[PDB]
Amino acid sequence: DTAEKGEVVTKAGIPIAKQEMSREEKLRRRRREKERIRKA
Amino acid sequence: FEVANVIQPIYTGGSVALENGARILASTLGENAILTELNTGKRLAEIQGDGEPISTLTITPSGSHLIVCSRSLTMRIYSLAISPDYDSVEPTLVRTTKPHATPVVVLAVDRTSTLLATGAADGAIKIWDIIGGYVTHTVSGPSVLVSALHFFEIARFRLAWGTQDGRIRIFDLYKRTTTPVYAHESNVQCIAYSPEQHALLSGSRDKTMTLHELLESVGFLGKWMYSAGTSGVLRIWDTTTHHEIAILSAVSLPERSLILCAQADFTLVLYRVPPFRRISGTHDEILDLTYILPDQSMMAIATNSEDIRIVSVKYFGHDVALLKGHEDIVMSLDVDWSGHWIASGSKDNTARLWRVDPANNSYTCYAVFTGHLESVGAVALPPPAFLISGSQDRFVQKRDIPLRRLAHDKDINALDISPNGKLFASASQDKTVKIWDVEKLEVQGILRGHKRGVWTVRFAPVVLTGSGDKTIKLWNLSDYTCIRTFEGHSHNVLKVVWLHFASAGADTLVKVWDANTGETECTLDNHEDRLWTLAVHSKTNILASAGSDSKVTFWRDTTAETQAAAAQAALKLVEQEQTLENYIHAGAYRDAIVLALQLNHPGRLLNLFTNVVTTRNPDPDSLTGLKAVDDVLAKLSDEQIFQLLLRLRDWNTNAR
Amino acid sequence: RLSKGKKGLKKKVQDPFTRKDWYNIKAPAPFAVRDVGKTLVNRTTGLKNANDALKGRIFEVCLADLQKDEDHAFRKIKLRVDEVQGKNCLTNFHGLDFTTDKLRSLVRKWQTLIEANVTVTTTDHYLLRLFAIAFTKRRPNQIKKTTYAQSSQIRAIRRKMVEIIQREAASCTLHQLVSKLIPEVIGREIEKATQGIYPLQNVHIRKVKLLKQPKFDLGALMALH
Amino acid sequence: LVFGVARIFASFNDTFVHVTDLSGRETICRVTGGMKVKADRDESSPYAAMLAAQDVAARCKELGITALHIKIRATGGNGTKTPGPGAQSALRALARSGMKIGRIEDVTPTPSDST
Amino acid sequence: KWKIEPFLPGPFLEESSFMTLFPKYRERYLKDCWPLVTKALEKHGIAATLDIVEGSMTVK
RNA sequence: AGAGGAAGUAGGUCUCCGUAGGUGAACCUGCGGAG
RNA sequence: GGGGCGUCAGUAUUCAAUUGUCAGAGGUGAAAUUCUUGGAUUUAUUGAAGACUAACAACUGCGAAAGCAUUCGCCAAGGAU
């Protein structure tokens, strides 16, 4: 809620941008968010 | 879409004032007060004022003060600061006082910059210092409405006032005694004085001046009297024998020898003393725009001023000419697609066809059409081929240049031709659109209906109907059904123009979109209250929007330019992202860190910083291990320092 | 803020107060003050000179500002104007009207009003109608609540009312008739002469209407002013 | 003090602030109630009457009469014989912005027998 | 748009006055309910008199 | 224009004085000066 | 303020005309239909038509009943004393 527009923040509290993030890490972050959504 | 440029009101209703520097000019629009240079025409400044309409303003011969008084009883003085460049000025307030119990209607400022006199509606008339708020002496008290004043000296100063009845009274400021002259029958409009001749001229509404048709402004130069009244003509008279040699106001510069005419068409005419240029004050309510020439340098606008004005688009404010053939109100307007023929429909029952001669000052109305008994509402054009005229009544007509029919029940609205001239459709208030054969008297069919009442049709070089509800439809020739329907407006639409589509509203917004998609592309929000008509540049995509408000806004397309900018931006982005990956792979941590701070994405910047603080072979004097990274951290800019700090708090959160 | 109109209806606005001039109004003879106001009329030229409109108009003005006495806050008079001078507007009597506030302020319950109308002609051949109203007097030292006159008594009162107003308005000219209308001599004499039939609380003349004036004579019309 | 006669037609649907000379013939300046309010619901409102009275008093003080005799009326034939809110609010705003008031009278058309 | 403000603060040249007439059975009740009426009309600034002899209420 | 197939991306106070006007002795406002 | 016939008025409404108009007016809880720069609604003055007789007007009057309220004239009739 207090991050920048282009960037995301991880669970570690570190800003990483969606542009510099690769395709494999994008897929893995989508899978982890979908795993949390399935848990809830 | 960006605003290419606007044309704006300069004058509406109130009093105009000229400084002895004939560059600057202060005029009124509504409640506001706007001052502009005359020669370059750009907007110097605009003071807002209070909510009530402004009554009277003046500027001193030295353009140092601007004194405004509204219809609410108030008076504000503004000091002005002019640079060597006359392009822009800043007005700042000095004094706000309430002069009398009634709002003042007349003001007069002396040739020197030290006294201004003001005259009210009850008759209480006073004199004030301009540099500081005084009443240096009150002169009459409230008797009858003061309609004129004049400051003069005899070669200490004296001031003359002319009342609402014919009473001219002169007093010395030092003697402080008023003496009338004989007194006069009706409303004296203005008083002027010649110091070369020791002579007072009084011009009045009973068509007389004392040492016609009407009188509004008289004055000297110079030995040549002048007069302006309801006749519309300025007349020049000799001083010594009475043989010679509407208008709301006229002032006398003559050291610069220009006389300004404030015509009650709300126009400003510059006359030379032995039509230099004219500037239209307000295009009051614009009924139709049509963008005319072969090269399209000169748009013809049409409004309530009982005539048409041709003003240039390629100084940008100068009107080339004025063309008057109609009698009542010019209502609609249409040009041939092959150049030189413009045609005008009117509240007068006559319609007409004018030539446009571009490389001359010649403009003629040489084709006229009697037609039917009601107002010719709209004109359409396929020497031109012929003319199709519509009507306030149901009588639609078609006539050739060197036939009638019944179409609808109510007043019809708009008319448009195809570029090949085989089809023709008409639109009206009884929710029908009618296409018919244009050569014979035959009918090709009928559009089924647009819910309330259809306002504008358009042909695609596919027919477009804009209606009285908040919808707009696209119909065909083949089935006579709507192909497309669109919503999204908040009032009437009143004009649909083809691109190279766009639609104005009556909800002051003009919006563009495309037909095969069918969803809204962009919306445009410049204007004041209303919007009426749209013209288009025929070569490129430039939209000219005008309405009941007097401003006309010119928009140009920028989509190709911003697409080229986004394309080259993505080119530069992929190039510098690859050189960042190259510097990371090569181990050039310095230029890698510079390029990462430029590319603003930090997940790689953190890895570069962990590497440079653990390089395993650090320089002993260096702060972060590398002298080059020390150099860039020393030579960082302010925005890069602040963005680095905004990343440093996020890296400082993590204990790793 | 947003307009509402149809296509091409707002004409260019012209100033209507260039063509207007003021004209002071003088009242006729029997009123106390003469300057009563000022009228904004159109500017004279060919094709309807403004003196025709000034001959046409009438004014309605109260009697308090005429007599300078606020006893007559009611009884609004009407002034025709038939003559014009230089910056001047000479007037004549046309009618005399109450205010409807006093017409409500006079009617009470349990008492009778008697109304009477006459069409009388003065010696200057002006026909005019006089409408008189007369409310019944509640006698002091009485106990009964209703002061009702009988119907035959009302008819006798109305007969004496029309006899008085005819006999005391047929003999004088219009200027003497207005000079008798101003301090209400007629209502006083009706009150004095009807009290042998049934006493009347207040007799007023509520309307005077001038129907026809067959003469335009500047001699008598200026002998007024 | 030049007395102009202000006809205030206060109905329930719209209020008419109208200013004439002493004759009744020559209209000086009128501002209706609905031309100052965007809503036909709130066309007859004290705010509408206040705006209309302020505009009328501003125009008549630009002309310099500064004194009015006020005649208030309503729909009186088969109507209500009572003025709406426009009368009270227009007279309040009219004398609150200058305008020494002279004589007030409520001249409603009262039928002797209508239907 | 509909709310009306109380008047915060000589607006009369001719001293206006109105009258109405009442009968006797109302004269009793008006005579012993009048001080409330003239109290509130004095708070509004208008003098209110009652006349039991003629039977007339006047405001001025 | 078409159902499918396969794929990718997501800043002048106070006081005084001289003025000019206001409703006048005084007093108020505005200005120009001195403490 | 019982009935018939005539007559006299009074406003108000509608319609029309003459001016001043100059943007809405009208309805509604909101709206809409409608009338609206050839000028609606409004302001003033006249003219015509049809209707009805405010306030007075009631723990009343008259008529057998329904009913009957502008003034004046005529015509018979009726009640009580």
Task: Give dist(CA D87, CA B327) in Å, integer.
Answer: 43
Contacts 24+ apart (CB under 8 A), B191-195: B191/B148, B191/B149, B191/B150, B191/B160, B191/B161, B191/B162, B192/B150, B192/B218, B192/B219, B192/B220, B192/B252, B193/B150, B193/B152, B193/B160, B193/B220, B194/B220, B194/B222, B194/B239, B195/B152, B195/B153, B195/B154, B195/B155
B132: Cβ under 7 Å from strand F?
A: yes
Contacting residues for B225 by C-beta, under 8 A, at least 6 apart: B201, B209, B218, B236, B237, B238, B239
Mutate one of B72, B74, B98, B143 to test the D interface: name it (highest D CB count within 10 A): B72
Residue of D2, D23, D38, D73 to mutate for C, most C C-beta atoms under 10 A: D23
Residue B595 CA to residue B632 CA, distance in Å, equals 11
Helix and strand numbers, DSSP H then E, in chain E: 2, 3
Of the CA atoms within 13 Å of residue B597, those in its CB half-sphere come to: 22
Is B404 exposed, middle or buried, given 0-12, 13-18 or 19+ CB atoms closer than 10 A?
A: middle
Residue C92: strand, helix, or coil: strand
D43 labeled part of a ligand binding site: yes
Which tokens is B231 given? 């006749």
Q: Running DSSP on this structure, what letter comes out for residue C149?
A: P
CB contact under 8 A, D95 and E16: no
Nucleotides of G under 7 A from a protein CB: 1, 8-14, 19-32, 36-39, 41-45, 51-58, 70-72
8 Å CB contact between B322 and B314: no
Contact of B335 with B321, CB cutoff 8 Å? no
Alpha carbons B187 and B204: distance in angstroms, whole number: 6
User: Which secondary structure element, helix H or strand E, spans residue C194, and what is its range?
Assistant: none
- Nucleic strand F near CB of residue B135 (< 7 Å): yes
* H or E, element range at C181: helix C174-181
Query: Which chains border C (3 or more CB–CB pairs < 8 Å)?
Result: B, D, E
- Which DSSP string do the residues of B329-357 spell out, in sequence order? -EEEEEE-TTSSEEEEEESSS-EEEEE--
Q: What is the resolution of this structure in A?
A: 3.5
* Euclidean distance between CA atoms C61 and C36, whole angstroms: 8
CB atoms within 10 A of CB B573: 12
Task: Tell me how far CA of residue B633 lies from CA of B585, B586, B622, B642, in angstroms.
Answer: 22, 21, 12, 12
Interchain contact, D58 vs B123, CB within 8 Å: no
Q: Are strands B351-355 and B341-346 parallel, antiparallel or unpaired?
A: antiparallel
Phi, psi of B387 (to 5 degrees): -140, 135
- Cβ neighbours, 10 Å, residue B175: 10
To test the contact with chain C by mutation, choose from D20, D25, D66, D73 the residue with the greatest count of C C-beta atoms within 10 A, namely D25
Amino acid identity for residue C206 in this structure: R
Chain position carrying tokens 């500047």:
C218
Cα(B124)–Cα(B138) distance, integer angstroms:
8
How far is C-alpha B315 from the chain's CA centre? 14
**How is residue A2 written in tokens?**
């207090």
Give residue B70's identity as a one-letter amino acid code.
S
Q: What region does B150 belong to: left with phi over 0, alpha with psi -120 to 50, or beta? A: beta
Asked if A14 and B606 come within 8 Å (Cβ–Cβ), the reply is yes
Place of tokens 């090949």: B420
The span from the CA of D70 to the CA of D103, in Å, is: 6
Amino acid code (one letter) for D78: N
Element of type H or E holding B560: helix B559-586
Chain centroid, CA E45 distance in Å: 10
DSSP state of C136: E
d(CA B190, CA B219): 9
Tokens of D2: 């030049």
Q: How far is Cα E23 from Cα E33, in angstroms, rounded to an integer?
A: 15
Cα–Cα distances (Å) from B580 to B400, B596, B628, B644, D6, in that order, read 73, 7, 17, 18, 82
The single-letter DSSP state of residue B184 is B
| Residue of chain E with shortest Cα separation from D51 | E1
Residue D101 contacts B where some CB pair is shorter than 8 Å = no
Nearest CA in chain C to D102: C65
Q: Look at the block and give the residue holding tokens 């800003």.
A: A15
Q: What are phi and psi of C173, to 5 degrees?
A: -85, -175
Between CA C60 and CA B622 the distance in angstroms is 104
- Which DSSP symbol is given to C71? G
Query: Using CA atoms, how far apart are residues C68 and E15, in angstroms rounded to an integer?
Result: 12
Q: Which residues of B551-563 are buried (b: 16+ CB within 10 A; e: fewer)?
A: bbbbbebeeeeee
Q: Is D40 annotated as a binding residue?
A: yes
Rounded CA separation B622/A20 (Å): 30
**Residue B96: both structure tokens together:** 């706000």
Orientation angle between helical segments B559-586 and B589-599, nearest 10 degrees: 150
Nearest Cα residue to B459 out of B479, B433, B439, B485: B433
Q: Which SS3 state, helix, strand or coil, does residue B369 take? A: strand
CB B234 within 8 A of CB B226: yes
- CA atoms within a 13 Å half-sphere pointing along the CA-CB vector of B163: 23
Rounded Cα–Cα distance for residues B555 and B540 (Å): 11
3-class DSSP string for B52-80: CCEEEEEECCCCCEEEEEECCCCEEEEEE
Q: In chain E, which residues are last before a break of more than 2.5 Å from C to the next N?
A: 9
Q: Which of B536, B549, B605 is nearest to B1 (CA)?
A: B536
Closest CA to B204 of B216, B192, B213, B212: B216
For residue B654, the SS3 value is coil
Question: Which conformational region is residue B649 in: left (phi greater than 0), alpha (psi within -120 to 50 degrees), or beta?
Answer: alpha
Task: Give the distance, in angstroms, between residue B377 CA and nucleotide G21 C1'.
Answer: 27
- Which tokens belong to B595? 């390029």
Antiparallel, parallel or unpaired: β D100-106 and D66-73:
parallel
In the sheet that holds E56-59, the strands lie side by side as E18-21, E56-59, E48-51
Q: In chain C, what are the helix, strand and coil shares in percent, each to the nearest 5?
A: 25, 30, 40
Q: Residue C136, class by beta-carbon neighbours within 10 Å (0-12 exposed, 13-18 middle, 19+ buried)?
A: buried
Nearest to D69 by CA among D16, D31, D18, D11: D18
Ranges of H-type helices in chain D: 46-63, 85-96
HSE-up of B450 (CA within 13 Å, CB side)?
A: 36
Looking at the complex, does the CB of residue C59 fall below 8 Å from at least one CB of chain D?
yes
Q: Write the single-letter amino acid at B113.
A: S
Helix (H, G, I), strand (E, B) or coil at B427: strand
User: Is the CB of residue B466 less than 8 Å from the CB of residue B533?
Assistant: no
The span from the CA of C147 to the CA of C199, in Å, is 10
B423 in helix, strand or coil?
coil
- Spatial separation of the C-alpha atoms in residues B543 and B560, rounded to whole Å: 16
Neighbours of B550 (CB within 10 A): 22
Contact indicator for D103, D63 with CB cutoff of 8 Å: no
Q: Which of D59, D57, D43, D61 is nearest to D90 (CA)?
A: D57
Q: With both helix axes pointing from N to C terminus, report the angle between B638-653 and B589-599 in degrees, rounded to the nearest 10.
A: 100
The answer to whether A17 contacts B601, with C-beta atoms less than 8 Å apart, is yes
**Three-point CA angle B124, B129, B135, nearest 5°:** 40
Between C65, C104, C109, which is nearest E23 by CB?
A: C109
Contact B172, B158 (CB under 8 A): yes
Is any Cβ of chain A less than 8 angstroms from the Cβ of B604?
Answer: yes
Would you give the end-to-end CA distance of chain B in angstroms? 50
Name the residue type at position B56. T
Tokens of B68: 């405004």
D7: contact with B, CB 8 A cutoff: no
Which distant-in-sequence residues (6+ apart) come within 8 Å of B163 by Cβ?
B123, B143, B144, B145, B146, B147, B169, B188
- Residues of chain D in contact with residue C57, where contact means CB-CB under 8 angstroms, are 23-25
C-alpha B587/C-alpha B637 separation (Å) is: 24
What single-letter amino acid sits at B351?
Answer: A
Burial B240-268 (b: 16+ CB within 10 A, else e): eeeeeebbbbbbbbeeeebbbbbbbbbbb
Contact (Cβ atoms closer than 8 angstroms) between residue C73 and residue C64: yes
Assign 3-state DSSP to chain B and report helix, strand, coil percentages, each to 5. 10, 40, 50
Contact of B11 with B30, CB cutoff 8 Å: no
Q: Could you check: is the Cβ of residue A31 within 7 Å of any atom of nucleic acid strand F?
A: no
